[PDB]
Each structure stands twice: as structure tokens, then as C-alpha cells.
């Protein structure tokens, strides 16, 4: 019940994502979501990914191995402290990864659920970061873009012919 994900140089990625209102049908696409992300072998995965410009990501802390799943449907970061560099990659850009990658330490989020009742969560470290990349998908942005520029053009030169052929392949 996967979708094939959506590689850089399609410009759904690239989209400002639109609210949910009809949540209906949100867990069940979710949990195709979630499928595709657990084949992947990732820990989040973004509407925008599967094609969808929609404010909708899951995540998790295989499906029996996980502590906490996450459908974060209309997500807001209402505060954020902290600041730490760390590794990320993308499903979208297969292979590639940044090391230092600055994120909010802690943050606050308000979102809905599948069912679209308000929650609020705080998170800290590695599922903060999981939730601020998930996020910066539904604003039509990438992990290299939160690189200050001189690291962020680094990053673009460095891995220039893979990003070609995900372009073209997109």
C-alpha cells in the first residue's frame, strides 16, 4: 500500500502545503504514510513526499518496534530554544546527508491528530529534529537550506551530479 516517493527536482517539494480541513480519510492515508516511510526505512515521512501538498507528516520514536507514532496534521512550532548541529538525509535525496544541520533543541508544536483534535507536544533532541524536517516539508524546504550559505553552497557543489539525476529522474 506504498507510494513511490518523490525525488528533488519535483516541484511538489518545493509547494507551500495546504491545511487539512476534511480529516476524514487522514488515518487511513496516514497509514499508507506510514507503510511507505517503514519500507523506506525512515522515521518520518511528509504529504508532500508522496505527491500530496498537504500539512500532514507521520513519524515514529517495524511497526512493533516503535515507542510513540506521530500524524501531524496542521502543524505549528510556537516555541523553540536551543540550538545543536546534527546528521540528516532525506528519502527524496537518496545517499545524500549533511553533518551539521542546526536545529531548535527543544520545541513546542501544536497540530491535530488523525482525527483532527487539537493536541500540543514538546519534544526535545532527535524527535525535535525529526519534527522540525518533517515540517520544513509542508513550507516547500530542504535540509540544506537550514545551512548557513557558505555550508549550504558547499553542500550543492559537493554532491552536484547526484543532484542532477534526481532532477531529471523526478
Given at each position: 500500500?506504498?507510494y513511490?516517493?518523490?525525488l528533488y ?35 518520518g ?22 515507542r ?5 496534521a ?21 545517499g ?9 533543541e ?9 482525527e ?24 516547500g524546504?530542504?535540509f ?27
Open positions: 500500500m506504498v513511490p516517493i518523490r527536482g519535483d516541484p511538489v517539494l518545493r509547494r507551500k502545503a495546504r491545511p487539512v480541513e476534511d480529516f476524514s480519510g487522514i488515518k487511513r492515508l496516514a497509514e499508507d504514510m506510514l507503510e511507505t516511510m517503514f519500507e523506506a526505512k525512515g522515521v515521512l511528509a504529504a508532500p513526499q508522496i505527491g500530496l501538498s498537504q500539512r500532514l507528516f507521520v513519524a515514529v520514536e517495524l511497526r512493533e518496534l516503535v510513540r507514532v506521530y500524524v501531524v496542521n502543524p505549528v512550532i510556537t516555541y523553540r530554544e536551543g540550538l545543536v548541529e546534527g546528521t540528516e538525509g532525506c528519502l527524496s535525496l537518496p545524500l546527508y549533511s553533518e551539521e544541520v542546526p536545529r531548535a527543544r520545541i513546542r508544536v501544536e497540530y491535530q491528530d488523525e483532527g483534535r487539537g493536541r500540543v507536544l514538546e519534544l526535545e533532541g532527535y524527535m525535535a529534529r525529526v519534527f522540525q524536517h518533517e515540517i520544513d516539508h509542508l513550507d524546504i530542504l540544506f537550506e537550514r545551512l548557513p550559505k557558505p555550508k549550504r553552497e558547499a553542500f550543492l557543489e559537493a554532491n552536484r551530479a547526484e543532484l542532477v539525476r534526481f532532477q531529471k529522474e523526478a
